[PDB]
Amino acid sequence: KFPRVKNWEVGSITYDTLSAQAQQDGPCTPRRCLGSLVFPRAPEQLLSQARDFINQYYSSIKRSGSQAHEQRLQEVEAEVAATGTYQLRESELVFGAKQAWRNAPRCVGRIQWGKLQVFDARDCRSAQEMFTYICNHIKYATNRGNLRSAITVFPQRCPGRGDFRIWNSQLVRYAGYRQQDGSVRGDPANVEITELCIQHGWTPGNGRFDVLPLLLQAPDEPPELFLLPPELVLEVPLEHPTLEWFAALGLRWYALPAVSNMLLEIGGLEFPAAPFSGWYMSTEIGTRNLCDPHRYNILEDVAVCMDLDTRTTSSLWKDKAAVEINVAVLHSYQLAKVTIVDHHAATASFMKHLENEQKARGGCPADWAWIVPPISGSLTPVFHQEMVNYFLSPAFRYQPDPW
Amino acid sequence: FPRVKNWEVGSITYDTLSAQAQQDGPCTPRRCLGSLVFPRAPEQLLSQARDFINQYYSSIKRSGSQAHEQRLQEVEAEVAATGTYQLRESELVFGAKQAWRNAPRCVGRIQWGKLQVFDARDCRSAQEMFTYICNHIKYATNRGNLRSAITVFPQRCPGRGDFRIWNSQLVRYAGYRQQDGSVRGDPANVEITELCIQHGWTPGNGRFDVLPLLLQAPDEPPELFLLPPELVLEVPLEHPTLEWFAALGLRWYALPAVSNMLLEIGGLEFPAAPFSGWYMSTEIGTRNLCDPHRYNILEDVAVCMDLDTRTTSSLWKDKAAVEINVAVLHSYQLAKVTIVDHHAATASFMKHLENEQKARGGCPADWAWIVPPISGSLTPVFHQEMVNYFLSPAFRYQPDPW
Ligand code: HEM
Ligand code: HEM
Ligand SMILES: N=C(Nc1cccc(CCNCc2cccc(NC(=N)c3ccco3)c2)c1)c1ccco1
Ligand SMILES: N=C(Nc1cccc(CCNCc2cccc(NC(=N)c3ccco3)c2)c1)c1ccco1
Ligand SMILES: C[C@H](O)[C@H](O)[C@H]1CNc2nc(N)[nH]c(=O)c2N1
Ligand SMILES: C[C@H](O)[C@H](O)[C@H]1CNc2nc(N)[nH]c(=O)c2N1
Ligand SMILES: [Ca+2]
Ligand SMILES: [Cl-]
Ligand SMILES: [Cl-]
Ligand SMILES: [Gd]
Ligand SMILES: [Gd]
Ligand SMILES: [Gd]
Ligand SMILES: [Zn+2]
């Protein structure tokens, strides 16, 4: 009843007994596996999720079955009966945010899941106040390059009132300007959000690394435009330790990855606006963001500059250029003293996380296709580690775009 | 019908072939086990045999014709007369091609229509097994112009043991347990190296000692056979610009010939049916030479390249891995031995996916095995969603004979 899980480098075997607690269904069936898909898509149903969450909280502090445990279950149950919903205690909100991170199958950085600064913005009332909370988040998390993981959670969804939403997918994003000749200047992943910014009154730039404004949605209001103070947005110019012409490409990336479009679910309550941030793994910038053909797509230009033979695939010019672009990212962030982790250290720490979690909970939900880095996969230990993917709660969840 | 998206181009297909999945994979709505390596009656036979004959005749457009009805009745009588039945040679050919075409973990299936089938179903002993295998290796090697081939030995049946090739491949380098715990040679082959020794093989002591074959005819024990060295084409590994790379003494063999999988066709089972194609360069230069539990040479190369190995963030592992793959591609091309690099191979699999969408509404594919083990996202398959399911005919794993 419990999946056997093998590490093929070491030969070691565990059994994932935690998957038996998966609280929601994924996309696979015995007939076919859809694990490679990007989008795998009241009263006492809310109550059973809430009771489970409270059970998790009281287990974490080693007070299960205590008087305080029972009283809090009764308190939640009575509030759901009266009002159709309930409120988390402050301590429960902190625990639930950390649990949602811990439960995220596609996150390789979960060794850190216990170190998370939780800003409680549940009393936020307007889009202006939203912006203040977000600026305080960026300042705290950036910390002049010594990055600190943080999450700010805005008011929960409730009936009779629209959601708080941040329309941008991240707090810091470069504009992508759609070109009439099909192409794009800037980041192509951000074409749609760029057009929404202009529609709502932003005067666009014409550079490749123009920081986007924020579109902030308060309940039952159209989004409002807010410009980030340039000194809040720490950026790193990209150079290479030995390829001095690299600096002339004029490349740059931003310090702080702050994801703002996912939904945080805790004990059946839903928080549609709860941006979270940590720090980058360098392959995100060096491999995906700069070398994906549908992103900045610089691979061929760098290889030409390296005087590689780009006319035959078998010279492995693509692999050589990509490796140096990753070197440039790592070197440039270290030179600027901005926290970054390379894919070797990050995957080694995840292996330690897996072993911690096997002891602590008897398994760990993990999405192999997302945990293995996009370069050098089998050079990292996670490649050889079998993994079990499943959905626990608290959880970070995809949600529709509010437009 | 699952929706399948390519995230580089934005194109959308629907896999209608998955609905015909013959067996069950390991996944459930509760949890996905797609990353696991091993996904943990006369009526039974007849049902599978009928589906396959129907597959075959539909594929030659003799659909429901008189040749179709007659073959169905022959199978029925043969199983009642004997408990099994015999494939026609054209059905055997079609069945081996389909089993390759259906293999979810094979990135080289663009070639699925081009397969030489050697019918060894009349084989009698391990000596004859050795002859078939030597002919296969000769034909497939073809002086380095590799040609895909499979040899099919007699099916299993009740009352009689099976034919088996005990070696996982026809060409394997010995793995020698050492008195200091380590392994000299290939750690993957420590078990079969000891089995060969146990059955009376004089061991070598090199890192690339080609193993003998342990071949097993029904019910008598296995016999050791030595491969004639001139039959085993090898490629000494050199680097186009790192002159010292040659002196590391690395080599690999030309012909990847997998000999421990079971071929299933129409409910019949062939426990010995060795098949061969040619290598994708990452199999050798990344997995076989750089896996920590294989030859594990990555740090050796990095030291020779004078890389800074005391910090992960110099990406010394990545640079050395790439140059080892460069040396592999260079050495095979120089030796005029067929090889395909991971860029060309994944570009061809994308075309295969497009051809299969038209041919039969989809294609079973195992994303984790299709995406190469270096430079994953530099290849088109990384951005391609895939659906994994089990069709028949098929190649399946099977327990070791011991
Ligand atoms: C502390 C350093 C961290 C590192 C190095 C890290 C690393 C990563 C990486 C490389 C990914 C895959 C992203 C992609 O390919 O698009 C990811 C995904 C994810 N991370 Fe982490 N992470 C960190 C912290 C955090 C924190 C603080 C949270 C939340 C509190 C978090 C939650 C998530 C979630 C929910 C995903 C899945 C996102 C998706 O499916 O799009 N991570 N992480
Ligand atoms: C002709 C050139 C071919 C290329 C370039 C190629 C490439 C590959 C690669 C790279 C793998 C992954 C193997 C691993 O990582 O261990 C694989 C798997 C596989 N191939 Fe192909 N292959 C070729 C021909 C063939 C042929 C002729 C057959 C059978 C008739 C075949 C059947 C299979 C099967 C069944 C697997 C799955 C193996 C497993 O699960 O262990 N392939 N192929
Ligand atoms: N591709 C699309 N959307 C899309 C869908 C699913 C997934 C993605 C991938 C986008 N992950 C962004 C992301 C999520 C989590 C972590 C990090 N990174 C970190 N280090 C970090 C951040 C915070 C703490 O740590 C980056 C994108 C799309 C839709 C329409 C057109 O394109
Ligand atoms: N060794 C083990 N693990 C393991 C288990 C299952 C599978 C594997 C992976 C081993 N595929 C070998 C293989 C299979 C198919 C294709 C190729 N390559 C080609 N190009 C080729 C050959 C013919 C035509 O083309 C290589 C490894 C094991 C089992 C028990 C203890 O350890
Ligand atoms: C189709 C495939 O699932 C898709 O390209 C995935 C694969 N693995 C990934 N892994 C990470 N970390 N990030 C991604 O965007 C993806 N993309
Ligand atoms: C655990 C994981 O399934 C295992 O390491 C897989 C991953 N992908 C692979 N992909 C290929 N082509 N060959 C392999 O042996 C593997 N091994
Ligand atoms: Ca209250
Ligand atoms: Cl990003
Ligand atoms: Cl191999
Ligand atoms: Gd230089
Ligand atoms: Gd030297
Ligand atoms: Gd060392
Ligand atoms: Zn699955």
Tab-separated table of C-alpha atoms in Angstrom, chain A residues 53 88-101 112-122 133 136-137 140-141 148-154 264 266 271 273-277 396:
chain	number	residue	atom	x	y	z
A	53	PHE	CA	-5.085	21.721	9.705
A	88	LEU	CA	-6.659	31.642	11.772
A	89	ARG	CA	-4.758	32.547	14.865
A	90	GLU	CA	-1.545	34.442	14.124
A	91	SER	CA	0.546	31.395	15.083
A	92	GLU	CA	-1.549	29.192	12.775
A	93	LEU	CA	-0.995	31.573	9.858
A	94	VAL	CA	2.797	31.382	10.305
A	95	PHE	CA	2.764	27.588	10.598
A	96	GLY	CA	0.438	27.225	7.597
A	97	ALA	CA	2.568	29.365	5.280
A	98	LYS	CA	5.665	27.329	6.193
A	99	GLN	CA	3.705	24.098	5.702
A	100	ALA	CA	2.543	25.192	2.255
A	101	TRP	CA	6.173	25.793	1.260
A	112	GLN	CA	14.917	26.268	4.067
A	113	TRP	CA	11.186	25.779	4.768
A	114	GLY	CA	11.453	26.518	8.476
A	115	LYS	CA	13.103	29.902	7.881
A	116	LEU	CA	10.347	32.116	6.529
A	117	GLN	CA	9.386	35.640	7.603
A	118	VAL	CA	5.577	35.908	7.629
A	119	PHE	CA	4.089	39.395	7.251
A	120	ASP	CA	0.444	39.398	8.372
A	121	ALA	CA	-1.434	41.832	6.115
A	122	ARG	CA	-4.927	40.411	6.806
A	133	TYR	CA	2.919	46.067	2.471
A	136	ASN	CA	8.070	46.628	3.012
A	137	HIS	CA	8.261	43.007	1.823
A	140	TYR	CA	12.958	43.215	4.076
A	141	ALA	CA	13.567	40.322	1.666
A	148	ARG	CA	15.767	36.634	3.355
A	149	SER	CA	12.791	34.442	2.587
A	150	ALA	CA	9.442	36.127	3.260
A	151	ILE	CA	5.711	35.929	2.545
A	152	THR	CA	3.043	38.630	2.972
A	153	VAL	CA	-0.516	37.327	3.238
A	154	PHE	CA	-3.337	39.671	2.328
A	264	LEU	CA	-2.215	30.068	-0.593
A	266	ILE	CA	-4.580	26.893	4.690
A	271	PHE	CA	-5.625	33.610	0.269
A	273	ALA	CA	-2.919	37.380	-2.705
A	274	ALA	CA	0.090	36.140	-0.740
A	275	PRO	CA	3.376	36.925	-2.562
A	276	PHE	CA	6.394	34.925	-1.427
A	277	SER	CA	10.103	35.272	-2.099
A	396	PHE	CA	0.413	26.961	-2.892
